[PDB]
Design an enzyme around this catalytic site. Sequence first.
Site, short mmCIF file in Angstrom:
data_model
loop_
_atom_site.label_atom_id
_atom_site.label_comp_id
_atom_site.label_asym_id
_atom_site.label_seq_id
_atom_site.Cartn_x
_atom_site.Cartn_y
_atom_site.Cartn_z
N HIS A 143 0.79 -1.20 0.00
CA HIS A 143 0.00 0.00 0.00
C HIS A 143 0.85 1.29 0.00
O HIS A 143 0.58 2.21 -0.77
CB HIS A 143 -0.86 -0.05 1.28
CG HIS A 143 -1.58 1.22 1.54
ND1 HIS A 143 -2.93 1.35 1.21
CD2 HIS A 143 -1.14 2.41 2.06
CE1 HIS A 143 -3.28 2.59 1.56
NE2 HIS A 143 -2.25 3.25 2.07
N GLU A 144 1.83 1.38 0.89
CA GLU A 144 2.70 2.56 1.03
C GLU A 144 3.69 2.72 -0.12
O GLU A 144 4.02 3.82 -0.55
CB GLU A 144 3.54 2.57 2.34
CG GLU A 144 2.67 2.70 3.60
CD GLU A 144 2.02 4.04 3.67
OE1 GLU A 144 2.80 5.01 3.31
OE2 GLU A 144 0.89 4.18 4.05
N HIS A 147 2.13 4.28 -2.95
CA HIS A 147 1.99 5.74 -2.81
C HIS A 147 3.17 6.38 -3.53
O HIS A 147 2.99 7.41 -4.16
CB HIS A 147 1.94 6.21 -1.34
CG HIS A 147 0.58 6.24 -0.66
ND1 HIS A 147 -0.57 6.74 -1.28
CD2 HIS A 147 0.24 5.84 0.60
CE1 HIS A 147 -1.55 6.65 -0.39
NE2 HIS A 147 -1.10 6.11 0.76
N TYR A 158 -3.71 14.85 -2.32
CA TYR A 158 -4.25 14.30 -1.07
C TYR A 158 -5.43 15.03 -0.43
O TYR A 158 -5.43 15.35 0.75
CB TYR A 158 -3.11 14.20 -0.05
CG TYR A 158 -3.26 13.01 0.85
CD1 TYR A 158 -3.24 11.73 0.28
CD2 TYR A 158 -3.39 13.15 2.24
CE1 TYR A 158 -3.36 10.59 1.09
CE2 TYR A 158 -3.50 12.03 3.06
CZ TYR A 158 -3.48 10.76 2.47
OH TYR A 158 -3.59 9.64 3.23
N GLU A 167 -5.81 6.84 -1.95
CA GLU A 167 -5.93 5.86 -0.90
C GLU A 167 -6.46 4.51 -1.41
O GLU A 167 -5.87 3.48 -1.03
CB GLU A 167 -6.66 6.36 0.37
CG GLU A 167 -5.81 7.27 1.31
CD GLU A 167 -4.59 6.61 1.92
OE1 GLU A 167 -4.82 5.44 2.45
OE2 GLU A 167 -3.51 7.14 1.94
N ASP A 227 -10.17 15.16 7.90
CA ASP A 227 -9.35 14.19 7.14
C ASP A 227 -9.11 14.53 5.66
O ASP A 227 -9.21 13.67 4.77
CB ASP A 227 -9.91 12.76 7.31
CG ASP A 227 -9.06 11.62 6.79
OD1 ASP A 227 -7.84 11.62 6.78
OD2 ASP A 227 -9.81 10.62 6.38
N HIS A 232 -9.41 8.97 4.04
CA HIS A 232 -9.39 7.60 4.53
C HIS A 232 -10.72 6.85 4.67
O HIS A 232 -10.75 5.64 4.92
CB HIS A 232 -8.65 7.55 5.87
CG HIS A 232 -7.22 7.96 5.81
ND1 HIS A 232 -6.81 9.26 5.99
CD2 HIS A 232 -6.12 7.18 5.61
CE1 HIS A 232 -5.48 9.25 5.90
NE2 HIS A 232 -5.04 8.02 5.66
ZN LIG Z 1 -2.35 5.42 2.22
#
Ligand SMILES: [Zn+2]
Length: 317
Positions: A143-144, A147, A158, A167, A227, A232
Amino acid sequence: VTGTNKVGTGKGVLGDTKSLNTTLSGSSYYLQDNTRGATIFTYDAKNRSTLPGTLWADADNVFNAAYDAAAVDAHYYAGKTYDYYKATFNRNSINDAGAPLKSTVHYGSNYNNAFWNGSQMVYGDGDGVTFTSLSGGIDVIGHELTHAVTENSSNLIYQNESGALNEAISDIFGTLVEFYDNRNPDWEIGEDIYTPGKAGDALRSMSDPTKYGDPDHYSKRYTGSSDNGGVHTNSGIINKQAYLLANGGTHYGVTVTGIGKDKLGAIYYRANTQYFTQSTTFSQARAGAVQAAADLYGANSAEVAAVKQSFSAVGVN
Ligand SMILES: [Zn+2]
Ligand SMILES: [Ca+2]
Ligand SMILES: [Ca+2]
Ligand SMILES: [Ca+2]
Ligand SMILES: [Ca+2]
């Protein structure tokens, strides 16, 4: 370091034995993997709030100590992520040019986090209650690291819908990485590291976002400012659409024929790399996903139809 390519052994966070690519230089072995198109380095911050720390060195090429575990996983899983991208799409690292992968483990004290910092991977060891060593979960790593790839492509901002899409993309891929390594696969995120004592949970679920209160339909999205505009939580909408496109199902009166994880992946990869922009909204994501599928399988294809069916199910046009 400059040395000779070696193959060691160690135990990861969950206690499984793993094969490690290290480098012998002088009298020690370093967690340095020279085998792939990109060099992979693993560092020790020694429970301090400093970066990057000291490159990891071992005396016998055996990483079996309790202190070793987070480093063994960080090391292994980053090479597995490179692999997924290289084999599937012929992508050479995060930037398509062989940028090196660096990870720091034992960052801080009982730190319940892990993130790509724009330059490297950062891993804390968790409080042993809410999380365990953060490097033991492949989907979170995938996942990261994904990014890092968006930043090198679409560069989704973002905030708002484009941030949620960011996300979502990262969850889709981390899931894809987990299936890739046959790492007991599923459609939930973070179950291997989250609340080590409670079996059953994850941080969020792609198959049923509502299990954790995330929306599963456009009509239920978070509308406020918190957020970065609900980055998220609203991703649950795109996550659900992705799940229905891969496996099929009936959602809100719409029946979707699944096309499998491999095409889901090719469609989104193509979309994120040629079509999405910094501020792509969910409606533009639909159109771009639709074009990717048309390019890949044909404009009048069954794949394209599934694409449409899947967004329809979640209220996106
Ligand atoms: Zn993320
Ligand atoms: Ca050792
Ligand atoms: Ca799993
Ligand atoms: Ca998972
Ligand atoms: Ca748990």
